[PDB]
RNA sequence: GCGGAUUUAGCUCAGUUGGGAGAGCGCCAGACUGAAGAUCUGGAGGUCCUGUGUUCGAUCCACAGAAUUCGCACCA
RNA sequence: GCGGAUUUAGCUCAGUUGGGAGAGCGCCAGACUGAAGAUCUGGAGGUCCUGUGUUCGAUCCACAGAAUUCGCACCA
RNA sequence: GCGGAUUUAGCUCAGUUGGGAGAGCGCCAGACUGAAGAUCUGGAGGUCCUGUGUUCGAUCCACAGAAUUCGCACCA
RNA sequence: UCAAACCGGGAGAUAGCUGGUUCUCCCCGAAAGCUAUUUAGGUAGCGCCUCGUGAAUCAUCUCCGGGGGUAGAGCACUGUUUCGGCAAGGGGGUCGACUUCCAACCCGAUGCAAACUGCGAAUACCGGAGAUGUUAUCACGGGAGACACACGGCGGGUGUAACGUCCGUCGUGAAGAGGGAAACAACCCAGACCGCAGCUAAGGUCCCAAAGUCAUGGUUAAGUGGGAAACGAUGUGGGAAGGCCCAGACAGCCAGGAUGUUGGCUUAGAAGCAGCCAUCAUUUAAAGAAAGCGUAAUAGCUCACUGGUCGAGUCGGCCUGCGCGGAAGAUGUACGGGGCUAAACCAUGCACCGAAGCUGCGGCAGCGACGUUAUGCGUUGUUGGGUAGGGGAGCGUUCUGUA
RNA sequence: GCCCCGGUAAACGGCGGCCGUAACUAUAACGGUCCUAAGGUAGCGAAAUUCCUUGUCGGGUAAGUUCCGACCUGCACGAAU
RNA sequence: CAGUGUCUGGUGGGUAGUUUGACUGGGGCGGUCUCCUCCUAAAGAGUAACGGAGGAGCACGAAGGUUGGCUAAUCCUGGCAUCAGGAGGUUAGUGCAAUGGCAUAAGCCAGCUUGACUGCGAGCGUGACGGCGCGAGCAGGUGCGAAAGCAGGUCAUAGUGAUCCGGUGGUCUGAAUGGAAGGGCCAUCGUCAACGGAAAAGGUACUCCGGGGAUAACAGGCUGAUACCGCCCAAGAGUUCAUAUCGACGGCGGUGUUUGGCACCUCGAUGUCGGCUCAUCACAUCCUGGGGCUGAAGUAGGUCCCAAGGGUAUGGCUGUUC
RNA sequence: GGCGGCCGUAGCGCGGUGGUCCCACCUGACCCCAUGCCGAACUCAGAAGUGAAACGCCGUAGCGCCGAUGGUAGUGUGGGGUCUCCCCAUGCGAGAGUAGGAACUGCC
């Protein structure tokens, strides 16, 4: 077959199918960050947290910096492991290393995925 | 006899040539032909030529086949020898229901006599039609 | 050098393919059928080629794909007898 | 009969972008030389095999015919 | 028909590291000689058989075609 | 396979006090001759097979490898 | 007897080379292909045939779940291919513009492909359920033959083509007899124990020849009774379509074909009528500046055109059936013959003749199945053709035993 | 013995392409220029050795693919082969 | 002195034994006899011919792997080398024949790196048969990666060969022990490409023989392109006048006497060529007979039609059929 | 704009209209961090300025692709005649032509 446009930008990753399970997509803005626990056949979002939404807490810091970046981890699997869910995959599409993305799966962990 | 074309040698050149005729409107009139048969190049010439050669009162002949089947033969001794292009030069495919010269005119038939001393120069016989 | 002689495709000898694991009946993860060579991503049962259709069944194993862009060489989504 | 080549100004020949007819020799004249010779220059000299056809126009294409030459063919 | 060789500037020929087109003779001019000759020097002179396919590029490779030549084959 | 010989400037070769790299021929130039020739003179021309080792330093020693040649060995 | 003796022995030399060899009956009953081979007038291994033993219960059209892209068709790659218009390049002719020709591109109309294809069969094929078949399906072992086929049909490839080569599927020739086709390996029907009766198949029903010289209707005349072609055909029959028809026309006969003008040009001359161009108008129901004959050129004579008189359907065109022309040859010419006009041909129909086929009685057998100790009975299936080959029973002969 | 050198042919052999000249034209004849050294000098031809060939001219004959003479580029003449 | 006996090297058909292949529209010459890929093969599979087109008998440490960045041909515009912009699924490129695959790529550029690891199984090649190959696991462990994972060489299908013997890596092995020299197990390399593998040239009109013509060289048969003849249309020629006569281009046919083709038949043998002698048959009539046309005044001819009844017949050179 | 559901007729071209909530463009590079030669990439920060690339809506169907109503060639399979060839029975049915579709649905 031939490669879909989805396959060309190699975004998705039909070797996490082959299994089964569930993904942990980071987003990043240049003002906000993004997590969620979507399921495969669509878009289907169990849980998620933005940064934006840590200040309901007590941030007061800026939103956009690594510190913040490990704190929505624990919180979208925190609210994970609330829902059901044991295991996921990281699903960093386009991104570095070291960078905010290995701080929010650095955080999965620490709550109990 | 399957319709060979392109990919070949070079052989000789068309002894046709003349479409004749004002090509600025175009009709639906004609010269059908009851039956199948292969017409050289060399005897559409004939046919052509003897018809546009009585229609000097006017024009607006055309003919719409143009051969394009090669025939090859192998004039030597057997074994070696596919086939070389001599007098058996290109050929056209006629249908059972082809027209082949048609000629753009309204009912001042001067061409029936035209197409009558072609009629007996191609091997079919053909009728006349109006339509 | 090169390559000339208007010409197509270039020919040898008969075909080296079969027809091995009709499946329905048991079958170890591994090349089912065979046609050409290199291909991945059937892990069962996964007979879904342009046309009528296509089919494979029964038979639990992790993986197994197909022979390449031939009988159905898309992957589907996995398949087992019916209770392994 | 068959097949191939050849058929341009007197002679020997070139000449296919189809659209100029040309060269050498020869002939005549000029120049030169005492002059004649040679050489240089100039001029004249063509149904460019014949007919028909093909094109806007053909020596230069097609078809037919004729002649020359060669190979071959048939001999109470 | 088969097989082999050959097909470069007017003539005769060289020219395979595929990337310069060249030699002799001839022709024209110069040098020289009283001069002509010879010799020496210089210049001009090439669809390097044709087409196509090759490589970045081919006279120099492949394929197809044509011509020349030789052997063979055919020949009431 | 084995042993012997050989492996210096384009060619043919000398060169073991280990400490200069050289000769003939050839090539270029000079001198000479009218000139060309010959002879004479001058110049250019060397990873002195390759690597490593040995010495203060090696073409000139040791070791290893390569090439040439030769004898021998092998060859259903 | 010699480009080289005879005899016997080794010898029953060897050969991938040729050929072949003696009783009866019963059951079943091939391959001429694949791979390798100094191999292709050879073998080995398989496919295929047969026999023996073992095991134990299942095989198959249609529907469903699938694989294919060949036919056909078409164009989106690709390679070809008609015309018009526009722009750019090159060459030639007269002027730095225009005209002509050639090649490439784009747009609208024109054409193609065995190694193209957006499409796409039928169809062949894997597997699974619903018939048929049963110790089959299958396993092991013994003995094979065999690797020069051919023909018809369908689909082919090559070739001008072939009682052509070379493939594929299938049915046959080979073991298809019987019947028809005049005679005839493969064309049609059809496939056999013996004897007997009956009915049919093919074909046939005027006679030879068994059966109607049958029924209704129509066509052909040629004896066509069919090589016989491309081609031709008012020989003749049938069917359909257009137009013209009782304002009597279309053809006879009478009388009539002019005026400018001998149209012009050209030409020795051309004055309707050599040729070159035109082909108008004046006077009427009607006459072309003239369709032919004719003159040296005129003249003269007809025609076209119209009236009088003479008096009914005609004319143009399309299609079909059968016959005819085209068809020239070898010791006497024909459908099997006689012969026939229907005992031809076409559309229908009725009644019969006609096989070892189908039905039926009796009889022999064999094989297999069921039950059985049984090859004894009962019942059941096929029914029972066979070259090569496999399996099995038997009669007769010689001599030697016991009774 | 061989490699190497040399004597020996009473062993196998070779003898082209071009230019000028000349001729009414083509050829042969002579010299050279080039390639590979030479390119056939002294002698000899369509000959039982020449195909093309009844080669060309001619004698001879009414007519001779015969013969004789000449020319001769002699498909593959030549000195004790 | 050598002779003679023995041995060694060289020369050595003078002599002897053999080999000198197969395929092959006969044989020979040419061309082939391993292997890969399209058509042919007629939509599964398999399938032939000196069947049509074309190649492999190697090359490569990178033309391998991964990652980052990037995307091509070709055309247009501003300056054919280069640079800037635009169009552009892709016709580029990807080692090698061809098809198939691929572009935020399996292509290009750059960097880095280097799995071509060891051991052992299951499966795949109708219908059994080895080496070899490939797809897919497991056990342990190399390389790269975060990891899944990816390698058993180069995207896949050509680049290859036995036994014997020799040379190369642990062990086993000969009255009794030590030394040396041997034999063996497993594996790698070296040759048979007439490539499922013999070491070996020629003459035969001096010939001999076995057999045969499933593979040719005649006659027959089919075909008929060639050959012979006819017909249709008819340009044109013939002073004018197509058709007295001649008659192109093109088209359609008959014959089968020629030649070519195929090779279906014969191939378990029917004495050659020419001539001569003698018998019968046929016609595409060269005349005689009766006619048509004419470029037919007459005469003499030219051409054509019906017709074969008869007559159609001979000589000189040459064996010769022109 | 947020947040769901169904979850390949949404390829590829083209037109009108609206939002200063949301969102990229944009702007600025102090620093984390990073470019073999270039904060372009990479990463961080602020919001001056638009909607021009997006997006919300909505209008053409060109061309691609997926369905539907009408029909002849073509083509299996088994008997008929006929010089070849054609015909009948039975299962289906090219391309051209007329139309359909340019998202759907709930909540703030």
């Given at each position: 077959?031939?490669?879909?446009?989805?396959?060309?930008?190699?975004?998705?990753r039909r070797?996490l199918?082959?299994?089964?399970?569930?993904?942990?997509?980071?987003?990043?803005?240049?003002?906000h960050?993004?997590?969620?626990?979507?399921?495969?056949?669509?878009?289907?979002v169990?849980?998620?947290?933005?940064?934006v939404?840590?200040?309901?807490?007590?941030?007061?810091?800026?939103?956009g910096?690594?510190?913040?970046?490990?704190?929505?981890?624990?919180?979208?699997?925190?609210?994970?492991?609330?829902?059901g869910?044991?295991?996921?995959?990281?699903?960093?599409?386009?991104?570095?290393?070291?960078?905010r993305?290995?701080?929010?799966?650095?955080?999965?962990?620490?709550?109990?995925? | 006899?399957?319709?060979?074309?392109?990919?070949?040698?070079?052989?000789?050149?068309?002894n046709r040539?003349?479409?004749?005729?004002?090509?600025?409107?175009?009709?639906?009139?004609?010269?059908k032909?009851?039956?199948r048969?292969?017409?050289?190049a060399?005897?559409?010439?004939?046919?052509?030529?003897?018809?546009?050669?009585?229609?000097?009162?006017?024009?607006?002949?055309?003919?719409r086949?143009?051969?394009?089947?090669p025939?090859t033969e192998?004039?030597?001794?057997?074994?070696?020898?596919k086939?070389?292009?001599?007098?058996?030069?290109?050929?056209?495919?006629?249908?059972?229901?082809?027209?082949?010269?048609?000629?753009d005119?309204?009912?001042?038939?001067?061409?029936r006599?035209?197409?009558?001393?072609?009629?007996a120069?191609?091997?079919?016989?053909t009728?006349?039609?109006?339509? | 050098?090169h390559?000339?002689?208007?010409?197509?495709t270039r020919?040898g000898?008969?075909?080296?393919?079969?027809?091995?694991g009709?499946?329905?009946?048991?079958?170890?993860?591994?090349?089912?059928?065979?046609?050409?060579?290199?291909?991945?991503?059937?892990?069962?049962?996964?007979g879904?080629?342009?046309?009528?259709?296509?089919?494979?069944?029964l038979?639990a194993?992790?993986?197994?794909?197909?022979?390449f862009?031939?009988?159905?060489?898309?992957?589907?989504?996995?398949?087992?007898?019916?209770?392994?």
């Open positions: 077959k031939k490669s879909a446009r989805i396959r060309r930008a190699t975004r998705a070797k199918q082959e299994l089964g399970a569930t993904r942990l997509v980071v987003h990043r803005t240049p003002r960050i993004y997590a969620q626990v979507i399921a495969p056949n669509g878009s289907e169990l849980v998620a947290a933005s940064t939404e840590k200040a309901i807490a007590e941030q007061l810091k800026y939103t910096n690594k510190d913040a970046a490990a704190a929505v981890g624990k919180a979208v699997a925190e609210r994970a492991l609330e829902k869910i044991k295991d996921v995959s990281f699903d960093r599409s386009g991104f570095q290393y070291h960078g993305v290995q701080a929010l799966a650095d955080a999965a962990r620490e709550a109990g995925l | 006899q399957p319709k060979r074309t392109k990919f070949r040698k070079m052989h000789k050149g068309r040539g003349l479409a004749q005729g004002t090509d600025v409107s175009f009709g639906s009139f004609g010269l032909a009851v039956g048969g292969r017409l050289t060399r005897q559409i010439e004939a046919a052509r030529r003897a018809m546009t050669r009585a229609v000097k009162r006017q024009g607006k002949i055309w003919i086949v143009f051969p394009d089947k025939i192998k004039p030597l001794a057997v074994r070696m020898g086939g070389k292009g001599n007098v058996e030069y290109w050929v056209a495919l006629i249908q059972p229901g082809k027209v082949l010269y048609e000629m005119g309204v009912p001042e038939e001067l061409a006599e035209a197409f009558k001393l072609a009629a120069k191609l091997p079919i016989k009728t006349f039609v109006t339509k | 050098a390559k000339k002689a208007g010409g197509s020919n000898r008969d075909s080296e393919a079969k027809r091995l009709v499946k329905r009946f048991g079958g170890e993860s591994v090349l089912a059928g065979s046609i050409i060579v290199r291909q991945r991503g059937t892990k069962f049962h996964a879904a080629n342009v046309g009528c259709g296509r089919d494979h069944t038979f194993k992790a993986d197994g794909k197909v022979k862009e031939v009988k159905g060489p898309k992957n589907r989504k996995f398949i087992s007898i019916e209770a392994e």
